[PDB]
Amino acid sequence: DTIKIGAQSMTESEIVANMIAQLIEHDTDLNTALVKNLGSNYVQHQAMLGGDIDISATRYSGTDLTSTLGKEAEKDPKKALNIVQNEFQKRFSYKWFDSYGFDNTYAFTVTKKFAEKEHINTVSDLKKNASQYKLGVDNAWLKRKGDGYKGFVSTYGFEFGTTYPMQIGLVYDAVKNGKMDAVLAYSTDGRIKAYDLKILKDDKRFFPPYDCSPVIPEKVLKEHPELEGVINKLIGQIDTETMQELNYEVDGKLKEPSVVAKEFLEKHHY
């Protein structure tokens, strides 16, 4: 029988999606298929409800909490994961696993060079000269509710001199070359490694946590009792630094997600 693994359009998702597949076909006699390009977690959720996917490869605690669950933004990561896991079991009898070990969080990011010139370690340090700064953001963040620009201004109490929305993949070279003074990066992106950018401390803890976990229905796990054991092998095994490294292997070194996943599994003896 064929285990269907859903992935959104993020390098991260495709990597972790392929990893799961390859781990399944290594440990068991089960067959796998990947359902690529699922857009948002809403569609990913619906695809699970409709039986289009047996496994959601990458899901993020702060996302499903304040949208799929409709709950308030918990800032403690363990408490937020506890809520999310309990609602998914109660509402859907879905097993939201413990985290792979990484956070994909919004991260105000600058060059180290610029952090020394402007004296910046925290997001709050950006206050003083904020009017003089260009900030790069993704295409959705300014209008985003809760942990968006609006909530940001209310919490940190300042505006950036100009904000420029753009495809997320562009913010990293943009900060690197000085086109933007700071950007709101995704903290798992490989180019944070490669370019060695500085992730500023979110001293007011504005952003909720975004720990990444696989989601699988207990019904799927029951029908294939060997499955949980396979997935459990990934739990705790991928921290932010590793995910950044795996991400650069695709985004910077131009390798296929299947290959990066294979090499990773081989490196760790699976």
Side-chain angles (χ1 to χ4, degrees):
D1 193 28
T2 296
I3 282 142
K4 298 178 296 311
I5 308 168
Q8 47 259 76
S9 312
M10 267 172 274
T11 301
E12 216 160 295
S13 309
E14 292 184 16
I15 298 180
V16 166
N18 284 267
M19 197 183 293
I20 292 164
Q22 281 177 38
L23 190 55
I24 287 171
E25 299 179 311
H26 171 288
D27 288 11
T28 76
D29 293 318
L30 301 151
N31 294 118
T32 68
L34 268 40
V35 182
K36 304 177 164 188
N37 313 111
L38 289 152
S40 60
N41 66 281
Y42 174 74
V43 186
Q44 266 218 102
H45 191 61
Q46 291 296 323
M48 195 166 294
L49 294 160
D52 287 343
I53 53 178
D54 303 301
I55 300 184
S56 178
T58 56
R59 299 284 279 289
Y60 304 89
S61 63
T63 303
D64 274 275
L65 174 78
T66 57
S67 82
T68 298
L69 307 173
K71 310 276 273 163
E72 207 165 70
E74 181 43 48
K75 300 314 170 58
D76 190 13
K78 164 154 143 47
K79 176 159 172 187
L81 167 63
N82 289 154
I83 296 162
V84 162
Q85 286 174 320
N86 287 52
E87 300 296 345
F88 271 65
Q89 194 62 245
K90 283 186 184 189
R91 300 176 181 210
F92 320 114
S93 274
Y94 287 172
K95 166 101 165 163
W96 184 291
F97 291 62
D98 292 354
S99 177
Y100 299 115
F102 65 90
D103 214 304
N104 196 8
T105 182
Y106 292 104
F108 287 98
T109 293
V110 303
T111 75
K112 282 181 198 187
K113 197 157 177 167
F114 179 95
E116 274 161 324
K117 176 199 154 210
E118 295 285 313
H119 193 60
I120 314 299
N121 307 295
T122 71
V123 59
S124 273
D125 292 331
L126 294 172
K127 191 176 191 212
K128 169 179 223 137
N129 287 345
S131 59
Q132 278 305 98
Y133 297 151
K134 309 183 181 187
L135 176 84
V137 295
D138 65 32
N139 287 131
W141 188 75
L142 298 166
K143 293 179 176 176
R144 173 182 186 84
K145 297 302 164 159
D147 56 348
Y149 195 39
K150 194 168 177 277
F152 168 88
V153 169
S154 177
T155 285
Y156 280 91
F158 70 83
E159 272 176 272
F160 289 94
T162 307
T163 57
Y164 301 81
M166 59 178 75
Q167 321 175 231
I168 189 60
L170 293 175
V171 298
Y172 315 92
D173 294 299
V175 178
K176 193 199 212 247
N177 310 131
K179 194 176 234 204
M180 293 292 112
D181 309 305
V183 294
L184 189 63
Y186 296 179
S187 65
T188 51
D189 184 291
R191 293 156 287 214
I192 299 191
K193 289 227 169 170
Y195 300 164
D196 196 55
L197 301 160
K198 190 195 184 56
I199 286 170
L200 302 174
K201 174 179 149 170
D202 164 24
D203 50 287
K204 291 190 168 73
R205 309 197 161 154
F206 167 61
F207 298 109
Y210 296 103
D211 300 304
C212 190
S213 292
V215 185
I216 316 185
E218 286 280 29
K219 154 188 174 66
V220 163
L221 296 174
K222 194 180 177 170
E223 301 170 334
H224 321 94
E226 36 189 354
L227 205 54
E228 191 161 328
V230 172
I231 291 129
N232 283 358
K233 293 173 146 192
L234 298 164
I235 303 320
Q237 296 293 335
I238 312 170
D239 62 15
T240 308
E241 177 167 345
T242 305
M243 194 67 252
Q244 274 180 8
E245 184 191 333
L246 296 171
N247 283 329
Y248 200 59
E249 301 273 301
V250 174
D251 297 323
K253 295 182 196 183
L254 307 167
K255 293 168 186 185
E256 288 264 39
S258 57
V259 174
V260 74
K262 182 178 176 179
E263 297 193 353
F264 176 81
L265 288 175
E266 289 184 352
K267 189 174 159 184
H268 292 264
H269 303 138
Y270 288 75

